[PDB]
Design a protein around this nucleic acid. Structure first.
Ligand SMILES: [Mg+2]
Ligand SMILES: [Mg+2]
Ligand SMILES: [Mg+2]
Ligand SMILES: [Mg+2]
Ligand SMILES: [Zn+2]
Lengths: 136, 58, 116, 76, 94
RNA sequence: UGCCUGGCGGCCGUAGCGCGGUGGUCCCACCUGACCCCAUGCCGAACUCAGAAGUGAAACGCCGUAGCGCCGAUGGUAGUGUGGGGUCUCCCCAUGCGAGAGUAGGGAACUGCCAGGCA
RNA sequence: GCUCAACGGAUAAAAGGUACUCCGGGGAUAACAGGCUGAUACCGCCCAAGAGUUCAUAUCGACGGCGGUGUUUGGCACCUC
RNA sequence: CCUCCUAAAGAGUAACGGAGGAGCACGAAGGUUGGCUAAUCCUGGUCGGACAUCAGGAGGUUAGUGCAAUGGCAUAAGCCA
RNA sequence: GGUUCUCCCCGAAAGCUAUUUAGGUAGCGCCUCGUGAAUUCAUCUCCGGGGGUAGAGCACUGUUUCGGCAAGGGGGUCACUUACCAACCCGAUGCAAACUGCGAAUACCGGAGAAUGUUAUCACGGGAGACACACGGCGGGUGCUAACGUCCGUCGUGAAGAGGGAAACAACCCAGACCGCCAGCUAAGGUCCCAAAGUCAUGGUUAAGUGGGAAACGAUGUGGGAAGGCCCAGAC
């Protein structure tokens, strides 16, 4: 599961998901998977979508993960009043903007890329699309 | 300077305190109050602030 | 480094006289010669300058730089300063100790009648 | 772990901005370290508080080879 | 070899730039050399088909604007974040 | 007035670093000697004294070089005041101001007083 | 000379029970219930490795995703002391 | 009571919001004068290794500052007499 | 809990600080009245400013992916190496309320200037009330980017404002009711009737009553735009 091994502080504020993305072009491989919608990707969603494609793109080529969560979300458990400080850390999320390249793949045919990225788009809570590396 | 005319179009109820102070500096009191002003950039900058709700006749 | 350690040593004494707006008397010491300049408080111009590389001073000297030469040029700057009348200059040791020719150039100018 | 304390916020910041004519002895900038440095007619306090030493206007300059900020007072 | 029809821009800033992108256009620029930079607007659908080939970024480009053929070269391209579109393309006179 | 060098500045990397070349009549630097004036938390390295045998090495000054640092547009993008609107977790439209990064490019500083040497 | 530490410090000097209770109030504040909300719960849908002798979708479904109902445990303290 | 963030580019700004720390120490660890420049790493090497101490080189404050943290500090507020 | 005649003018607050205080009270802010005061204050323009938030970036403080180079350590060795693990450094790429080598918009502070405003400003004095605020937009903390949830900043309205519109609906939109009239022009909002006004004109879309509640996702529904393959040696 993708999570930071060590942080300077345990907790973090809620924040917002405003602004545009900066991960625009594929710069590691030739094929990419770019996010269209807006939302957050939890630690389970990034791990499951990596497992979802890897089944069909068997052991050749190379897959990069362009994002990293670096943001915890705390929860208040059931039958607990409001207050009593901030709750305990449960799972890590990543702030994702429209235009962020999430998943990349190289060393595969283009027809194989269309299949695996379709199989990983259902596991993601936001809409995605297929992109291809353009030079310069 | 030369004379222009400023006529208020909308009301001053839901406005910001800066927009309420702008209409007091322009001498506008109600909808339809046509009054004469000078065309200096100090007055023109007051027009640019409330241009959504005033009518100007050059 | 040799020269840059001398500059950082004097730098506290340089900018302190800048904060007071007084006229400083800097010295440069050399195994050959010795220098002394009276500087305006802006720092970009001098008013009284006399050294031992000038032939007017070196004729009466056996060697160009010693404790006898610093007494000669210390008086020589001080005599040119009284002709101008800068009258309570400040003394800048400029990174050297106040033991040798720096002390000899200062005490010679104290004997002439300058207020420092 | 057992958090929930905060001190009284000390009233720092710039109290006299540039262009303002101040009196001799007035406090310009209250500060902890030397965020601003003393310059012309400006004294540095015990707690690094920069104050006025002459009647004039506040002038901010960035001098020195280390690109540090200064406060100077020019005569009005 | 590539010929691109262009027109000179009459306004500047992001105000005119967003009005061109809502009207199937996008702004660009031509700089380099001893000449002043010239504000250039370009048709969006024409450039989008041409840029799909690798020769659009390597070869020497020709632009016909105001009865003048200026030989340039593609230096940098700004793309839309999530849609497959273009934003701004840099041109160096070569 | 030119060239070269020292001192104190203005300025604070378009003033730096690296590389290559060069300067010794003067200048500065190292160097010579040191019982002594003094100095070392050991040490004449530094500090400082007394001298000039030697020398442009180290350092410094200048010239040349775009490897690096740095400076840096035009246009575009992100953001935002005011007003309006939408599919209202967000974004668009009208108008005003305009980034950051990156690119073209600039760039081996400039300048003031005074002193010395050469012509 | 005060850990007056409850630290702008009611006394030099102070722990409990009340279901035998009582008064003055309060929906400004709980318990029954409504209402708001939908984490949880219930139900449905999308992608399909795997189970189904072979064979994803006859019957099922991991890792994950999107809703509906207001239906459990709640959250809130908006109506009512 | 103190430090940072929440705090929305002045100040101010809450919550049983997020991370700590203090009820001192000090006659020098104060004042002043005169000096001094680390962290890390390379190479060399009687005892000597991972470190005892040095030399030069690289590096130029990432070191240090009686302590919590921030803002400072080379003219050093660091260090020594 | 209740407080009884009328008329006119002005008009709050639900904040801060402190409290055996938390539904109380005091000072201050805010309200009214009176005196006094500088051209005081507000708005815009220019000038003088300080920024480190939005964003952006990874030099620094932390984190993270890949590649190259690799001291060391393990193993093989009769001084070197191997299909081993791997720090630092270098290139590429992200993320951060408590990162900033960068950097706004406005806001804020000061100066000058015109216009406008019944001094709207400050000082002082007499008397208060209030210190339970609500929701909406925006910037957030918290909560599930749940709450007609809670806690702040800012603005608006309500509270303390009727009227018109959103069917009805304090907080939304328009607009602040001196009174009378069977006048007109308009705002938001509408024009086939209920119910006042186009069964209006032009160019399209939709055939589902969508409109007139609801997502991922699925489909030869249809309208619009650009780029290709094949074909009068006869294509589909
Ligand atoms: Mg706009
Ligand atoms: Mg020597
Ligand atoms: Mg040499
Ligand atoms: Mg820029
Ligand atoms: Zn089946």
């Amino acid at each position: 599961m993708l999570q930071p091994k060590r942080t300077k502080f345990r907790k973090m504020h809620k924040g917002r998901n405003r602004g545009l993305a900066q991960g625009t072009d594929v710069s590691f491989g030739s094929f990419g998977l770019k996010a269209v919608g807006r939302g957050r990707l939890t630690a389970r969603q990034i791990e499951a979508a990596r497992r979802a494609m890897t089944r069909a793109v068997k052991r050749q080529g190379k897959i990069w993960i362009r994002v990293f969560p670096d943001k915890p979300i705390t929860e208040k458990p059931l039958a607990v009043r409001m207050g009593k400080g901030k709750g305990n850390v449960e799972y890590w999320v990543a702030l994702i903007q429209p235009g962020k390249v999430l998943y990349e793949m190289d060393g595969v045919p283009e027809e194989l890329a269309r299949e695996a990225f379709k199989l990983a788009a259902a596991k993601l809570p936001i809409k995605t699309t297929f992109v291809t590396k353009t030079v310069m | 300077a030369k004379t222009i005319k400023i006529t208020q179009t909308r009301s001053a109820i839901g406005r910001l305190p800066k927009h309420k102070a702008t209409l007091l500096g322009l001498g506008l009191r109600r909808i339809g109050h046509t009054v004469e002003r000078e065309d200096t950039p100090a007055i023109r900058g007051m027009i640019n602030a409330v241009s959504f709700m005033v009518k100007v006749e050059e | 480094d040799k020269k840059s350690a001398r500059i950082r040593r004097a730098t506290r004494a340089r900018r302190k006289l800048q904060e007071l707006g007084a006229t400083r008397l800097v010295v440069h010491r050399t195994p050959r010669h010795i220098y002394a300049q009276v500087i305006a408080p802006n720092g970009s111009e001098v008013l009284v300058a006399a050294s031992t590389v000038e032939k007017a001073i070196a004729e009466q000297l056996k060697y160009t730089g010693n404790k006898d030469a610093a007494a000669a040029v210390g008086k020589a700057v001080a005599e040119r300063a009284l002709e101008k009348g800068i009258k309570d200059v400040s003394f800048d040791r400029s990174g050297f100790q106040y033991h040798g020719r720096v002390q000899a150039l200062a005490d010679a100018a104290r004997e002439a009648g300058l207020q420092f | 772990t057992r958090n929930g304390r905060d001190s009284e916020a000390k009233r720092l910041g710039v109290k006299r901005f540039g262009g303002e004519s101040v009196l001799a002895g007035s406090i310009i900038v209250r500060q902890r370290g030397t965020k601003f440095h003393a310059g012309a007619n400006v004294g540095c306090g015990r707690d690094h508080t920069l104050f006025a030493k002459a009647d004039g206007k506040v002038k901010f300059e960035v001098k020195g080879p280390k690109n540090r900020k200064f406060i100077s007072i020019e005569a009005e | 070899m590539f010929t691109i029809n262009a027109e000179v821009r009459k306004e500047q800033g992001k105000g005119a730039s967003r009005r061109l992108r809502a009207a199937n256009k996008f702004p660009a620029i031509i700089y380099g050399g001893k000449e002043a930079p010239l504000a250039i607007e370009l048709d969006h659908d024409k450039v989008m088909n041409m840029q799909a080939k690798a020769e659009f970024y390597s070869e020497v480009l020709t632009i016909v604007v105001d009865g003048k053929e200026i030989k340039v070269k593609a230096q940098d391209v700004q793309r839309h974040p999530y849609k497959p579109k273009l934003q701004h393309i840099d041109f160096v006179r070569a």
